[PDB]
Design a protein around this ligand. Structure first.
Ligand SMILES: [Cl-]
Ligand SMILES: [Cl-]
Ligand SMILES: [Cl-]
Length: 323
């Protein structure tokens, strides 16, 4: 069998095209180039993966049209058997689960993704949740916080490096010019001084927009984070987008429920930090400030086999990274 390689600049450009034609902005993580690309025979859809141990671990569901997604999943199983490796899918949607079942994979709960319904989101709606955001938006504007947007290529990357340094791989983006040049970038300035930034995952449609890197200067005001997020939500709402993703919160960050099946517990082993799980304290509570809708995300592993092995390889690949 041939060699698993990183994609070239021609392949990356082809992948970038596929993402634009999709409703899957999170596919933009393929553009770091540290993930191998499995293109459909039509070159209208791709799947991204990495190898760790005897496992081949795909990142997210395949990027592309519905039918091509399903056929890529079968392609991947074929490719995995050709290399004598076990297929693993990291952070997949429940709707694609039947396809993973068909190639002989079961699943473990990994966490939950928070997405804000932009069409329903309004700061003048009821509830104290909206009240607090109105305060954050005005109090923050008094204090000199301002959100700006830069087309791809723009934005002082030297000023971004300052925040980035004061503040990996596979499931995350990389602070490199080659990568950040692909995306729109939002910057928060405290009375002119850069205090936070974030690259923006978009598509040519307005179905979904999400996040990747989001780094904040440690000396920045407390509200900078909340302000930056709220600003992005209002921004994409105005642009006419339907949903905005705040990212995922792994199991340990959700409300603890023991007495639960191992299927909905074992997924925690992906995020271990020494003698402790990453607890992701307040991460759920923070995302909940914007009243998002939560949806499960799964880790697809070979069925009828001890998932501890695939969990180990997945844990190693992730190396503790999250948005
Ligand atoms: Cl996702
Ligand atoms: Cl999907
Ligand atoms: Cl402060």
């Amino acid at each position: 069998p041939p060699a698993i390689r990183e994609p070239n600049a021609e392949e990356l450009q082809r992948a970038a095209r596929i993402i634009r034609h999709s409703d899957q902005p999170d596919g933009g993580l393929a553009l770091t180039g540290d993930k191998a690309l499995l293109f459909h025979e039509s070159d209208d859809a791709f799947l991204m993966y990495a190898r760790r141990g005897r496992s081949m671990i795909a990142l997210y569901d395949p990027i592309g049209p519905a039918m091509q997604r399903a056929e890529l999943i079968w392609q991947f199983r074929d490719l995995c058997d050709l290399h004598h490796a076990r297929p693993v899918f990291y952070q997949v949607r429940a709707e694609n689960l039947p396809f993973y079942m068909d190639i002989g994979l079961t699943a473990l709960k990994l966490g939950e993704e928070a997405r804000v319904d932009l069409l329903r989101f309004d700061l003048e709606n009821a509830g104290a949740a909206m009240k607090d955001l109105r305060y954050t938006w005005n109090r923050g504007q008094r204090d000199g916080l301002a959100l700006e947007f830069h087309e791809p290529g723009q934005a002082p990357l030297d000023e971004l490096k300052a925040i980035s340094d004061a503040w990996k791989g596979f499931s995350l983006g990389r602070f490199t010019p080659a990568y950040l040049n692909f995306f729109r970038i939002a910057i928060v300035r405290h009375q002119g001084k850069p205090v936070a930034f974030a690259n923006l995952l978009e598509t040519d449609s307005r179905e979904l927009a999400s996040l990747d890197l989001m780094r904040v200067h440690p000396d920045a005001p407390k509200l900078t984070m909340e302000f930056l997020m709220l600003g992005l939500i209002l921004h994409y709402k105005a642009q006419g987008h339907a949903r905005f993703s705040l990212g995922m919160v792994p199991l340990a960050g959700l409300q603890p429920r023991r007495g639960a099946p191992l299927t909905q517990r074992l997924g925690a082993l992906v995020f271990r930090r020494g003698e402790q799980f990453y607890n992701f304290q307040g991460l759920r509570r923070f995302k909940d400030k914007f009243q998002p809708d939560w949806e499960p995300r799964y880790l697809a592993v070979p069925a009828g086999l001890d998932p501890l092995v695939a969990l180990a390889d997945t844990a190693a690949l992730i190396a503790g990274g999250l948005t």
